[PDB]
């Protein structure tokens, strides 16, 4: 959504890809891609229905101090 | 911080400002979305030695970024804080990480080599003995451990030690500790800079690491070195305390 | 949709894959995968916003006659 | 169809049943989601030779699958239907394709080799001279072209030809045509089977192809061969007419 257009005699399988905003990183054992199956479930192959996490990035200042 | 530079670009998003209930300012270091490193002496400020961790936590005020208040859940003193001047602060909420608020990394390598230059930011007192209005930083090199022990004590031998501290008050020096000498002038750390990180910039990874936490912040350019807690010497206790 | 769960400090990019039911075949110069961009547009890389078509399969009887 | 087999499994989803306005039944072949192949003689049934394409279309009734009525938009006679007994029917709506309704493929190869076995389905008359109640099919082999011309005409020479047709009425025979002999018994095509496809099963691709459209359906097992229109000889006109 917003609703992919439907085609005659066709059907859509919905995929979703998780990504983290700044200033975060994706924490997951899968590739972040989840596909919706018949059971209203977004399934990754294969961390299962386990969703990813967005962890903060350490020690990457936007404006680092002047070098030594 | 005596002398040094103004944090004009906001280059230390891990720096926090802690205030005691009698308006003394000290430092803390964001190492996590919920946890901060500081010194035990900072937490016992304006308390008695008889106070506990549950006594200290409600009396603290903590700011990150641009005067951003963060609620404290609890504090965890190091089991041996008389030799390892370290405490951990846990926030109730994960702080939102942006360009003004960001944790520093805990190092996997030992960077505390004699001569390595680190950055120390701090809200401590300046040349006028006044708490600074804006965050300042200074570049300091790691000093020789034996020369440091010799300057603040008698000698390396335990049965030969004497006070001899040019500031009177004695720093804690042991295996968990390294020193940082004068940069090149008379600029140094001072009262209130404790709890801040001796930050090392790993040029190979382009990543900033908390190599030390400033413990002895009373060598206000009249004694030689500040004394820092090796973060590598407490990393195991830090990871265990965080969980939980 | 049905709504992929949201994660803190994360976001989703929606993909969709078109397939034809029986007894049809997919007619498209792309791979049938369309990704939703910022302009409410499902874009394939790269037939553009051109949607696929489902064409009927000829000469594949479900129950063919007994062999010669 | 005399003799043969009942389409008991529904193995000819491309077969259509066309009915004239005086209740004569003929065949048509779905080649497309909107188009069907048939013979010109079928479309001129119960009309005068003066009728046009726009005259014929409204008077037709067409069924596919299991007695499923489909609306006709128009018909397109072959520009030379006196030698190429072929017409195209276009439906108003794309027919829904399933296991009972499915077009046959148009061939890219020439399968009309003497002896190749093809399947002919049909709603034509049976051994009792009655229009069949259920769809029937028969397996017929392609016959020798010269022996066929010799049986229905005088000889190969134009200046030597005579009627000689055992059914009296003469089939159309030329370059666009091939014949199909008796299978092995006295089973054959008959009145009403015209418009149906001489379907070839390409075992290499496992695909069924309309190699011919039955034109002469009056050799009701008393003459030798039925006469079919080569689909490869009209494929160019078919693709042009479909667009549009
Ligand atoms: C605290 O001190 C004791 C000294 O007996 C030592 O064994 C123990 O490991 C120390 N704990 C930590 C967490 O360093
Ligand atoms: C119809 O007949 C003429 C004969 O002069 C031939 O040239 C033309 O190509 C034929 N048209 C088609 C579509 O076969």
From Swiss-Prot, chains A, C:
Task: Please list the residue ranges annotated as the Sushi domain.
Answer: 1-56
Q: List the disulfide bonds.
A: 20-54
Recorded superkingdom: Eukaryota
Q: What is the effect of changing residue 38 to D?
A: In allele HP*1F
Query: What name is this protein filed under?
Result: Haptoglobin alpha chain
**What organism is recorded for this protein?**
Homo sapiens (Human)
Q: Which gene encodes it?
A: HP
First-to-last residue of the parent protein present: 92 to 159 of 406
UniProtKB/Swiss-Prot annotation, chains B, D:
Q: So which residues have sugars stuck on them?
A: 23, 46, 50, 80
Where are the residues of the annotated region Interaction with CD163? 157-162
Report the record's disulfide bonds. 148-179, 190-220
Domain named Peptidase S1: residues: 1-243
What is the protein name given in its UniProt record?
Haptoglobin beta chain
């Amino acid at each position: 959504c917003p609703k992919p257009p439907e085609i005659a005699h066709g059907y859509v399988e919905h995929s979703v890809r998780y990504q983290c905003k700044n200033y975060y990183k994706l924490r997951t054992e899968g590739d972040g891609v989840y596909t919706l199956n018949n059971e209203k479930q977004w399934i990754n192959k294969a961390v299962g229905d386990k969703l990813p996490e967005c962890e903060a990035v350490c020690g990457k200042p936007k404006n680092p101090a002047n070098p030594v | 911080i005596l002398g040094g530079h103004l944090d004009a670009k906001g280059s230390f998003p891990w720096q926090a400002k802690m205030v005691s209930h009698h308006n003394l300012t000290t430092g803390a270091t964001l190492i996590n979305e919920q946890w901060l490193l500081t010194t035990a002496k900072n937490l016992f400020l304006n308390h008695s030695e008889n106070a506990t961790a549950k006594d200290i936590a409600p009396t603290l005020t903590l700011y990150v970024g641009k005067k951003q208040l963060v609620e404290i859940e609890k504090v965890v003193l190091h089991p041996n804080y008389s030799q390892v001047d370290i405490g951990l602060i846990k926030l109730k909420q994960k702080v939102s990480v942006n360009e003004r608020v960001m944790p520093i990394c805990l190092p996997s390598k030992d960077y505390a080599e004699v001569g390595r230059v680190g950055y120390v930011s701090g809200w401590g007192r300046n040349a006028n003995f006044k708490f600074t209005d804006h965050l300042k930083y200074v570049m300091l090199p790691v000093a020789d451990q034996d020369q440091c022990i010799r300057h603040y004590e008698g000698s390396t031998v335990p049965e030969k030690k004497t006070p001899k501290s040019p500031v009177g008050v004695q720093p804690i020096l042991n295996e968990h500790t390294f020193c940082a000498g004068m940069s090149k002038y008379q600029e140094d750390t001072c009262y209130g800079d404790a709890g801040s990180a001796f930050a090392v910039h790993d040029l190979e990874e382009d990543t900033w690491y908390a190599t030390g936490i400033l413990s002895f912040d009373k060598s206000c350019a009249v004694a030689e070195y500040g004394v820092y807690v090796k973060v590598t010497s407490i990393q195991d206790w830090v990871q265990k305390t965080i969980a939980e």
